[PDB]
Amino acid sequence: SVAHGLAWSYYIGYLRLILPELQARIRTYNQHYNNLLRGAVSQRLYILLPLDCGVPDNLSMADPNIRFLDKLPQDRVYSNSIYELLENGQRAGTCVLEYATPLQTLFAMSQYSQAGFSREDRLEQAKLFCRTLEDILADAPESQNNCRLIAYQEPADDSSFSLSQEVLRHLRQEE
Amino acid sequence: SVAHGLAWSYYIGYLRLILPELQARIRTYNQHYNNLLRGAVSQRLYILLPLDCGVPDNLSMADPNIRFLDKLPQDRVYSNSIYELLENGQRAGTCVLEYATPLQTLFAMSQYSQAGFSREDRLEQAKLFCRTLEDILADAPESQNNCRLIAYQEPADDSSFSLSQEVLRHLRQEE
Numbered sequence: 001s002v003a004h005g006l007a008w009s010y011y012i013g014y015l016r017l018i019l020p021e022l023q024a025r026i027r028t029y030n031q032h033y034n035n036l037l038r039g040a041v042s043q044r045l046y047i048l049l050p051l052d053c054g055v056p057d058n059l060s061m062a063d064p065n066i067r068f069l070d071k072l073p074q075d076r077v078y079s080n081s082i083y084e085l086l087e088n089g090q091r092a093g094t095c096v097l098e099y100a101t102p103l104q105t106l107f108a109m110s111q112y113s114q115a116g117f118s119r120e121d122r123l124e125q126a127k128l129f130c131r132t133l134e135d136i137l138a139d140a141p142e143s144q145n146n147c148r149l150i151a152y153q154e155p156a157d158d159s160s161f162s163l164s165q166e167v168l169r170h171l172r173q174e175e
Numbered sequence: 176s177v178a179h180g181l182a183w184s185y186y187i188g189y190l191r192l193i194l195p196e197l198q199a200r201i202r203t204y205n206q207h208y209n210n211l212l213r214g215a216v217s218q219r220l221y222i223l224l225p226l227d228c229g230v231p232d233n234l235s236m237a238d239p240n241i242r243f244l245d246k247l248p249q250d251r252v253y254s255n256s257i258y259e260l261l262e263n264g265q266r267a268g269t270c271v272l273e274y275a276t277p278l279q280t281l282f283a284m285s286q287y288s289q290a291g292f293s294r295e296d297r298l299e300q301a302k303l304f305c306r307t308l309e310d311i312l313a314d315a316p317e318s319q320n321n322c323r324l325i326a327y328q329e330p331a332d333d334s335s336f337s338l339s340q341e342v343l344r345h346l347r348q349e350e
């Protein structure tokens with residue numbers, strides 16, 4: 001099961017490094033664009049976990065209601081992004097939002113014949129990745145409340161899917 | 176069984192990306208950065224895989240007989256390093272050398288109390304990581320002939336082990 005290693009690597013190699021100073025970075029950003037914003041950038045890292053492992057390199061196309069606002073400023077250096085979430089045509093929220101890159105690995109594997117990795121396998125591992133990461137975060141309260149996991153599938157009944165609504169539903173669980 | 180995911184992530188997200196253009200960068204380098212007495216750089220990525228997962232944040236400080244020579248120059252950016260290997264003071268070879276970074280993840284895990292991840296578990300995963308990666312590489316020849324995995328365990332009598340000697344053993348049996 002690749003999911004297990006993938007989740008631990010993601011946590012140990014990335015989340016555990018960046019989450020500690022996140023709260024300070026967004027704050028610094030908030031203080032300096034407070035004139036322009038008011039409608040402060042919310043504080044947690046929102047991690048998108050599309051279970052179909054479909055990962056554009058751009059929420060700048062994923063949803064008309066998600067719009068790139070700005071780069072969150074400040075071996076590995078971290079390029080986080082701030083986005084506004086619209087609803088009813090209005091800005092309804094702003095948050096640091098990104099895809100869980102290990103889902104790309106799972107996707108690449110399923111596309112790599114020698115991996116012997118079926119579509120059923122990939123989805124199952126994606127689910128296992130999400131679950132494992134949740135368990136990891138559960139045991140690190142400090143990190144668990146510095147980020148939010150947003151896992152989703154697009155509906156079978158080809159009714160319309162809203163990535164922004166998915167994000168907003170979590171973002172409103174807090175405040 | 177974190178080793179599974181670590182190996183696949185390392186292959187998909189790094190090795191399979193970098194190995195395709197390795198021999199080109201090495202060829203290119205073996206001239207256009209003219210240094211009179213510089214020796215030819217060997218053709219493959221040599222990857223250090225200590226089973227104890229002990230990765231120094233350097234590479235030279237583990238062994239004075241491994242000496243940094245140059246950065247291998249390159250749409251992502253990659254940091255690879257060239258070293259000369261000494262034997263009785265003499266230059267016995269020149270190669271592109273680095274540690275397998277996923278072993279750092281295994282070491283960090285064993286240090287992370289809540290992982291429930293012991294030194295014994297770490298060694299088991301380290302071996303599995305090597306075996307898994309070797310298996311992956313075997314079914315990807317165009318990438319297997321471009322790198323060499325150097326897995327080793329260190330004898331309790333450290334006077335009986337030299338990291339440079341280990342690299343040299345592999346370096347000597349090839350082109």
Ligand SMILES: [Ca+2]
Pocket residue numbers: 330331332333
């Ligand atoms: Ca010893």
